C-alpha cells in the first residue's frame, strides 16, 4: 500500500545517501589545499548600458561574445553591441512581464518568457528589416523562469509548473516534458554538449535531465531553500547552484555529490544568478545585497566583489571567450566588467 | 571622428532607438498600474467586468483621461514569493474579498474558512516587503448576498468574540474593520475600503478617486513635504 511504497522510497534514499558517503573519500578543499590561490580579482566597469527604464530580469550573451540580449519589465528586449554600447535592436514584448531571455547560438533568434506562460521566439534576421515574433510556444501552466536554445529549432524552457519542456519551434509543440520536480523550476543550464541540462527548483533540488530520453538521471538536494540560479561547469561534468540559502554549491555529476559550498557569514541575502569563467576557476554569483561576488571555484575563499550596481543583481553572464562579464540589475543598468 | 560611415550610421540608429525607448517609457509612466488580487472567485472577475486561460490577464481601460492597466494574476497557481516582486512599482493593489464567504467553507479544505483565508492573503500582501508604500483598495464584493444571508446565519460563526446585532450595517463595518486592522503599516500606506455596488458603475469611480488620492500623496511624499 502507500506505507510500503513510502518505506521503499525512504530506504532507496538511504541507499543513495550511503553510496554517496562511501564515494566521498576526500573533499575538494583538501584536494586543492595546496594550489596557489587566485589573485585579487580587480574588475572595473568597462561598459555601462543605460537603455532600460525598468528592472532588468535576464541577460544573455551571443555566441560571438559581442552581442548581448537583455530583458526588462518595461516591456523591452534590447540587443546591444557590447563593444560600442550601441543598441542593435529594441523589441517591444507582447507581455511586459518577462523574467528570462535567451540568445540563439546561431544568433538568428532570441527568446523571451515570463508571467504570461508563453515563450516568444523572435526572428532577428528578417527581410522586412524588423524583428518579428517567429513563434509563441504555449503550453506551460506557470510562468517561464528560464529558456535556452539547444539549436535554432529546439528550445528548452523551465516554468513554475514544476516541469521543464523541450519544444520543437517549427511545429510549436512540446517534443518532451520533464516532470520530476515538486516545486517551481526557477533556473536552467544546458550542458556544453547540449545533451544534458540541469534544472534547479524551489524544492531545493537540482535535477539532471537528458533531452533525448526525457528522464531525470540524477538529483541533488544539498540546499536549504529555493534554487534561484544554476550554471554548468565548462567541462560539463559539474555545475553550480545559487539559492536563497545565501550559499552557492558545486555538484559533480559523476560523483553525484556536492563538492564545495561557497558561503560567508557576512552574506545573508540570496543569489539571483551564478556563472563560471571560461576556465571554470572563478564562480561569479550575483547576490541580492547589490554586489556580485567572484569566488574561487577550487578554493571556497572569495576572490573579489563587483560593487557597480545600486540594486539587486538579477542576471549575470560571462562571454564565451571569457573576455567580459555582464551584470544586469534592478537599477536598469547592465554593466560590462573586465 | 575615427568612426567609419557604417559605425556612424549604427550610432545614429542607436540614438533613434534610445529616443523611442525614452518616449515609450515616459508614455508608460503616465499610466496607472493596478495589481488585482483576490481569493478564488471573490467577485474579482466581476470587478474586471465592471471596468472594461493561464498567466497574467491585463485589462487596459481609460477613465476621465486616466489610463489604468490592471493585472489580474489570479491564474498563476504558482509560488507567489517568486514573482510578486515584479509588481513592486504598482500604483495600487485592488484586493477583492467576497463578504458572502464569511460562512462558506473552503472547497479545497473543509476545515478552513474562506473569509479567514482572504484575511491571511490580505495580511501577507499588505505587510509584504515589496508593498510597503503601495496603497490597497479593498473591494468588499457581493454585499447584497451577504445582507440577505446574515439574517439566516450570524457572523459569529466566522468571527469569534463578535458582539454585534447581526444587522447588515454592523456586521459589514465589523468585517471592514477586521480587514483594515491587519495593516501593520498605517503611516506608509492607506487602505481605501469600498462595498461593491454591482448595479451602478460606482466601482470604477471609487478606483479613480482612490488612485487620484494615491497620486496626490505620492507627489507630496516625493516633494518631501510629508
Amino acid at each position: 500500500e502507500l506505507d510500503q511504497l513510502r518505506q521503499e522510497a525512504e530506504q532507496l534514499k538511504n541507499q543513495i545517501r550511503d553510496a554517496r558517503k562511501a564515494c566521498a573519500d576526500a573533499t575538494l578543499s583538501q584536494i586543492t589545499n595546496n594550489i596557489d590561490p587566485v589573485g585579487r580579482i580587480q574588475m572595473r566597469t568597462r561598459r555601462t548600458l543605460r537603455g532600460h527604464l525598468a528592472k532588468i530580469y535576464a541577460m544573455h550573451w551571443g555566441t560571438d561574445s559581442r552581442l548581448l540580449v537583455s530583458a526588462s519589465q518595461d516591456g523591452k528586449l534590447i540587443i546591444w553591441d557590447s563593444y560600442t554600447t550601441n543598441k542593435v535592436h529594441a523589441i517591444p514584448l507582447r507581455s511586459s512581464w518577462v523574467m528570462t531571455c535567451a540568445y540563439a547560438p546561431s544568433g538568428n533568434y532570441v527568446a523571451c518568457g515570463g508571467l504570461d506562460n508563453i515563450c516568444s521566439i523572435y526572428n532577428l534576421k528578417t527581410r522586412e528589416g524588423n524583428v518579428r515574433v517567429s513563434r509563441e510556444l504555449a503550453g506551460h501552466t506557470g510562468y517561464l523562469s528560464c529558456c535556452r536554445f539547444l539549436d535554432d529549432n529546439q528550445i528548452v524552457t523551465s516554468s513554475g509548473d514544476t516541469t521543464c519542456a523541450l519544444w520543437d519551434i517549427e511545429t510549436g509543440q512540446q517534443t518532451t516534458t520533464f516532470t520530476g520536480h515538486t516545486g517551481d523550476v526557477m533556473s536552467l543550464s544546458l550542458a556544453p554538449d547540449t545533451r544534458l541540462f540541469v534544472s534547479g527548483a524551489c524544492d531545493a533540488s537540482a535535477k539532471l535531465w537528458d533531452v533525448r530520453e526525457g528522464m531525470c538521471r540524477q538529483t541533488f538536494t544539498g540546499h536549504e531553500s529555493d534554487i534561484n540560479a544554476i550554471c554548468f561547469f565548462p567541462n560539463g561534468n559539474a555545475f553550480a547552484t545559487g539559492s536563497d540559502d545565501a550559499t552557492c554549491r558545486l555538484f559533480d555529476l559523476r560523483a553525484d555529490q556536492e563538492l564545495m559550498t561557497y558561503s560567508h557569514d557576512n552574506i545573508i541575502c540570496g543569489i539571483t544568478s551564478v556563472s563560471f569563467s571560461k576556465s571554470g576557476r572563478l564562480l561569479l554569483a550575483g547576490y541580492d545585497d547589490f554586489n556580485c561576488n567572484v569566488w574561487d571555484a577550487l578554493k571556497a575563499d572569495r576572490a573579489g566583489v563587483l560593487a557597480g550596481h545600486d540594486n539587486r543583481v538579477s542576471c549575470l553572464g560571462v562571454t564565451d571567450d571569457g573576455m567580459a562579464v555582464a551584470t544586469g540589475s534592478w537599477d536598469s543598468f547592465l554593466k560590462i566588467w573586465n | 571622428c575615427t568612426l567609419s560611415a557604417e559605425d556612424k550610421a549604427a550610432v545614429e540608429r542607436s540614438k533613434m532607438i534610445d529616443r523611442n525607448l525614452r518616449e515609450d517609457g515616459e508614455k508608460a509612466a503616465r499610466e496607472v498600474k493596478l495589481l488585482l488580487l483576490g481569493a478564488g472567485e471573490s467577485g474579482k472577475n466581476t470587478i474586471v467586468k465592471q471596468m472594461k486561460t493561464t498567466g497574467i490577464v491585463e485589462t487596459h481601460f481609460t477613465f476621465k483621461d486616466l489610463h489604468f492597466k490592471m493585472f489580474d494574476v489570479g491564474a498563476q497557481r504558482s509560488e507567489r514569493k517568486k514573482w510578486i516582486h515584479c509588481f513592486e512599482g504598482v500604483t495600487a493593489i485592488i484586493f477583492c474579498v467576497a463578504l458572502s464567504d464569511y460562512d462558506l467553507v473552503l472547497a479545497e479544505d473543509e476545515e478552513m474558512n474562506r473569509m479567514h483565508a482572504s484575511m491571511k492573503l490580505f495580511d501577507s500582501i499588505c505587510n509584504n516587503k515589496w508593498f510597503t508604500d503601495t496603497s490597497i483598495i479593498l473591494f468588499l464584493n457581493k454585499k447584497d448576498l451577504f445582507e440577505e444571508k446574515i439574517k439566516k446565519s450570524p457572523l459569529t460563526i466566522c468571527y469569534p468574540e463578535y458582539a454585534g446585532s447581526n444587522t447588515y450595517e454592523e456586521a459589514a463595518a465589523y468585517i471592514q474593520c477586521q480587514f483594515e486592522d491587519l495593516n501593520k503599516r498605517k503611516d506608509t500606506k492607506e487602505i481605501y475600503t469600498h462595498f461593491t455596488c454591482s448595479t451602478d458603475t460606482k466601482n470604477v469611480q471609487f478606483v479613480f478617486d482612490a488612485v487620484t488620492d494615491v497620486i496626490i500623496k505620492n507627489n507630496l511624499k516625493d516633494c518631501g513635504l510629508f
Partner: single-chain antibody
Amino acid sequence: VQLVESGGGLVQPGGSRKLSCSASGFAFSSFGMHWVRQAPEKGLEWVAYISSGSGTIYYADTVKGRFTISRDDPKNTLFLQMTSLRSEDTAMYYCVRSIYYYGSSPFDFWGQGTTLTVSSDIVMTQATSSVPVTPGESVSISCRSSKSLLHSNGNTYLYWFLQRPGQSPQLLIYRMSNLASGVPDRFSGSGSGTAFTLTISRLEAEDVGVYYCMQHLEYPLTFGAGTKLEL
C-alpha cells in the same frame, strides 16, 4: 520586399524633375535610403543618401546643391528633387535600401530603377573587363582601392554587387567576405586591404553580368568600373 521608382522621362536641360520611390514589404522607417545612378552603358555612380529619420544626408559632389533627397516615412516613399539637370544627369536611377547596425547587410535590395534622359575621394579600379570565361571554370574578378579599406575596428568596407543584363543590381558580398543572404555559396570574397578578389566556384546561366566593387569606408561611396563576364 520591393522598391518601385517613378517620375523619370524626357526632360529639357536645366529643368527640374522629381523622382519617387515607393517602398513596400519592409519597415521603410528603419532603412537608410540611397539613390544610385547608372549612366547609359557605364558603371554605377552613387548620388545621394538619407538616413533613417533623416538625421544625416549626404550628396555626391557632382550633384551637391542641385539635388535634394527626402523621405516620407508615413507614406513609405523616397523623393529626389533635381533642379538643374545637366547633360551628365542622363541615367537610370536606382533606389537602394541599407540598414546599418552591427552585422547588418547594407545595400541589400535595389529598386528596379527609372530612366531620366535630358535633351541634347577613394577610387576603385577594376582593370579586368570582358572576361570570356566559360561555365564550370572558376573565375576571379579583381578590384583595387587607392586607400586601404581596412578600418581600425577590423571591418573592411568593400562590397561586391552583381548586375545581370536587363536587371537591377543585387548585393553579392558585404564587407569583403560576408556573403549576402539569398546568394549561392559559389561566390567568395577576399582581400588584403587594398586589392580584393571575388572568386566564383562554379558558373551558371545567371552568373553572367557586370560585377561592381563599392567602398563604404567614407562618403562619397565609389563604385569601380564594371567588370563584364561573357560565356
